[PDB]
Ligand binder design. Structure first.
Ligand SMILES: CCCCCCCCCCCCCCCC(=O)O
Ligand SMILES: CCCCCCCCCCCCCCCC(=O)O
Lengths: 156, 156
């Protein structure tokens, strides 16, 4: 928890458009419902000059796919960020090649991880790396999305 | 779909108590909600003398974990059964060692598969066989349960 972070991460280089191709979580309840707590769909990453990371994502809330904006502040570790809210919340970058895929986990046990990809395409190779990275962890739900869903709001 | 069935299946030998240790499905919607269509928890298998298979399971329906009794009739293929209802529905036995684990899929595309085990224990070896069997298939949700859940009705 978690035993992989990426060495030599350049945060400025994860900038831009992402798709949440697959999500996994330690507890069924974290991803189960459409309004489930960690069931979130990444849209864009906006690294600040000071090295913080602004995240744009969608979440299903009322009975509606809602927009969100959250701030992840840098820590001393280049691959690890803290989310602004309660209580608190660590984001860890496990692996990325910047131009294709990015694996991250969010913890706080309580744990969810996603495979991000740059395009609305099923990347078998990034998915295989996501599954390799997660065999080490205690995940009890896993979801993956098809290209049609990846182009809809909240992957409907 | 599906490309593995078990050779030399003796149906009388799958008789008795089972636990649904892991479930996977082609479509998120088939397992997503607690009342989702293929979200079913196997309790016991009762093979008839004529080679049909009576299945006792639990399903979440009203706002309640309900009991069910379904009949799977034999076909010409020893590892494949047809479920009584609409419209219609094929059950295929992929692999079992009788005394520990049993892998099956239900189709009708539309596809769900489970890893059954004889005890409320996490069998890493049967799970690895379930994952091997499913790498071949187009699954978009996967769930697994812990021993505590396995001893509760509807794995709550
Ligand atoms: C490298 C960047 C990875 C992206 C990290 C995404 C972090 C998302 C964490 C959001 C937590 C849940 C937010 C839901 C807010 C709510 O409705 O309560
Ligand atoms: C070797 C035996 C494997 C066990 C096969 C279990 C088959 C279960 C299929 C049930 C289909 C869904 C039933 C729900 C009925 C409903 O509420 O509509």
């Amino acid at each position: 928890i978690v035993t992989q972070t990426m060495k030599g991460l350049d945060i400025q280089k994860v900038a831009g458009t992402w798709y949440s191709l697959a999500m996994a979580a330690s507890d069924i309840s974290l991803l189960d419902a459409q309004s489930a707590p960690l069931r979130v769909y990444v849209e864009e990453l906006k690294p600040t000059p000071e090295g913080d990371l602004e995240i744009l994502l969608q979440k299903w809330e009322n009975g509606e796919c809602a927009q969100k904006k959250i701030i992840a502040e840098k820590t001393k570790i280049p691959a690890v960020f803290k989310i602004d809210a309660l209580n608190e919340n660590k984001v860890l970058v496990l692996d990325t090649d910047y131009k294709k895929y990015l694996l991250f986990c969010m913890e706080n046990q309580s744990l969810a991880c996603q495979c991000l990809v740059r395009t609305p395409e099923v990347d078998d190779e990034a998915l295989e790396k996501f599954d390799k990275a997660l065999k080490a962890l205690p995940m009890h739900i896993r979801l993956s999305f098809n290209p049609t869903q990846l182009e809809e709001q909240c992957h409907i």
